[PDB]
Amino acid sequence: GQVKVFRALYTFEPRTPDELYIEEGDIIYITDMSDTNWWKGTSKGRTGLIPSNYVAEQAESIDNPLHEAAKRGNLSWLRECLDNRVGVNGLDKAGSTALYWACHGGHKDIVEMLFTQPNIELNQQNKLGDTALHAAAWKGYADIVQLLLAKGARTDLRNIEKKLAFDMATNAACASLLKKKQ
Question: Is Phosphoprotein found in the keyword set?
Answer without folding.
Answer: yes
